[PDB]
Structure 1
Amino acid sequence: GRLIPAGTGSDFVRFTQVVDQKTLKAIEEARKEA
């Protein structure tokens, strides 16, 4: 009953992250903070 290693379950595509530019720069300046 696991998630198959094909399609959307592939190690190639499945760790892909989405982020918007606002949240992206919001983090980017916080990692540029320290």
Structure 2
Amino acid sequence: GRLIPAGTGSDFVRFTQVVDQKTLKAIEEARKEAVEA
């Protein structure tokens, strides 16, 4: 009753994320913040 090995359940696509350029600059701002003192 597990997800099918074949299809959208492909190891090649089971993992794929999406972004808005707005959330793109938001995460890099998180990286900028990493600079200590």
Q: Same fold per TM (> 0.5)?
A: yes
Count of matched residue positions in the alignment of Structure 1 and Structure 2: 34
Moved over 3 A (4+): none
Q: Normalized against structure 2, the TM-score is what?
A: 0.68
Output the CA distance in 2 between the equivalents of 1:3 and 1:12.
14
Q: Normalized against structure 1, the TM-score is what?
A: 0.71
Over residues 2-34 of structure 1, what are the superposed CA-to-partner deviations in whole Å (9 max), with x where a residue is unaligned?
111111101101101011110111011211289
RMSD of aligned alpha carbons: 2.3
Q: Choose between structure 1 and 2: higher helix proportion.
A: 1
Larger radius of gyration: 2
2:19 alignment partner, SS class: strand
- Same amino acid, percent of matched pairs: 100
